[PDB]
């Protein structure tokens, strides 16, 4: 091609969006933003496919124009704005807020939150460096950067950010025994506790995680998002408590739930 693309095909859309093959040829094609296109929900398929607020694409355009959808403290009029991982989606008219956390199957699940919970939001620092005049900057897994951080934050760590100030309320050091979350790969959307980290010079580091049920798994270091201070998470967990159950026991889960409600 002679330049950047601006169309995404429906089939070429990310799998976790749970889009269907028949309604349209194309896909939302989220605009550039804080997060990559492979791990973000455009607002169109959050208000039309998740909450069913809009029936087609023109209604979600109209409601974005009416300026009630406030992402992360700021209004967003873009129909295909990339929401991304654990960003606050506040609708002030309904008085309800949302947190975009992967479920146990690695998909962005609808997760309502309390108004006091949405006043803060976690982030994962990606690169630490110092700019001009000896002013340390600190970029995060979003496109955000903040000046003058606490020197006790290193790379691949976690920072608590309270909204409308952009200040570090507190910090979580990426360490053994601290509750984390997988953010990619096969084990995407799993909640566990770090047990070991092996380092490979010049290659991707590999961590080992053991969850509450004793199930152990591994993933690359770039797929680690520490959220809990040791064992207590700093964010309300989604339904299911972030444990991946095998194919066997959701069958009897549905069977027993159907029998109990029938």
């Amino acid at each position: 091609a002679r330049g950047p693309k601006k169309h995404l095909k429906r089939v070429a859309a990310p799998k976790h969006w749970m889009l269907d093959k028949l309604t349209g040829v194309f896909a939302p094609r989220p605009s550039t933003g804080p997060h990559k296109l492979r791990e973000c929900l455009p607002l169109i398929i959050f208000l039309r496919n998740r909450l069913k607020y809009a029936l087609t694409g023109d209604e979600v355009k109209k409601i974005c124009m009416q300026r009630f959808i406030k992402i992360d403290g700021k209004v967003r009029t873009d129909i295909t704005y990339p929401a991304g991982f654990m960003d606050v989606i506040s609708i002030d008219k309904t008085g309800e807020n949302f947190r975009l956390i992967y479920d146990t199957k690695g998909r962005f699940a609808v997760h309502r939150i309390t108004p006091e919970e949405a006043k803060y939001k976690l982030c994962k620092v990606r690169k630490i460096f110092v700019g001009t005049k000896g002013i340390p900057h600190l970029v995060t897994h979003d496109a955000r950067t903040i000046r003058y951080p606490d020197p006790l934050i290193k790379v691949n760590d976690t920072i608590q950010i309270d909204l409308e100030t952009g200040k570090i309320t507190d910090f979580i050091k990426f360490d053994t025994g601290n509750l984390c979350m997988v953010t990619g790969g096969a084990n995407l959307g799993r909640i566990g506790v770090i047990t070991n980290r092996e380092r490979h010079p010049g290659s991707f580091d590999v961590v080992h995680v053991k969850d509450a049920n004793g199930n152990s798994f591994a993933t690359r270091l770039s797929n680690i998002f520490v959220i809990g201070k040791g064992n207590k998470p700093w964010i309300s967990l989604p339904r299911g408590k972030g444990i991946r159950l095998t194919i066997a026991e959701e069958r009897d889960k549905r069977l027993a739930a159907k029998q109990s409600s029938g």
Partner: protein, 131 residues
């Protein structure tokens, strides 16, 4: 009229678009498909809403008659109904008029205006002769 039951499910009101969205399944046992007017007034009577703001669309009759499923949009004000709706639904009730020309003549008109440059009388008078 003896047996026309109108049930609704999946109901939810969104104050985002100032409307209450619901899917309605009518049940006419041996009658034909019920027209949208009768659905509109009965649904309005159930919700104590005025029978000029209710919208119903997409009615699919099940096999052998009886159940027929449609989608209903009820609004808290007719002004909001004119504010945010597809133009074809507003045109069905007559609130919006779409008496236009066909798209082909519009495309001929536009490409005719490309030739004439800038003249405030002929860039708009380009289609006066080829109507």
């Amino acid at each position: 009229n003896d047996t026309v039951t109108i049930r609704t499910r999946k109901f939810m009101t969104n104050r985002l678009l100032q409307r209450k969205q619901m899917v309605i399944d009518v049940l006419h046992p041996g009658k034909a498909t019920v027209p949208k007017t009768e659905i509109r007034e009965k649904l309005a009577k159930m919700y104590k809403t005025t029978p000029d703001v209710i919208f119903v669309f997409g009615f699919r009759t099940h096999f052998g008659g009886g159940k027929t499923t449609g989608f209903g949009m009820i609004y808290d004000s007719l002004d909001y109904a004119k504010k945010n709706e597809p133009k074809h639904r507003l045109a069905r009730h007559g609130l919006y008029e779409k008496k236009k020309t066909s798209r082909k003549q519009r495309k001929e008109r536009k490409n005719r205006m490309k030739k004439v440059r800038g003249t405030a009388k002929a860039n708009v008078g380009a289609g006066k002769k080829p109507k």
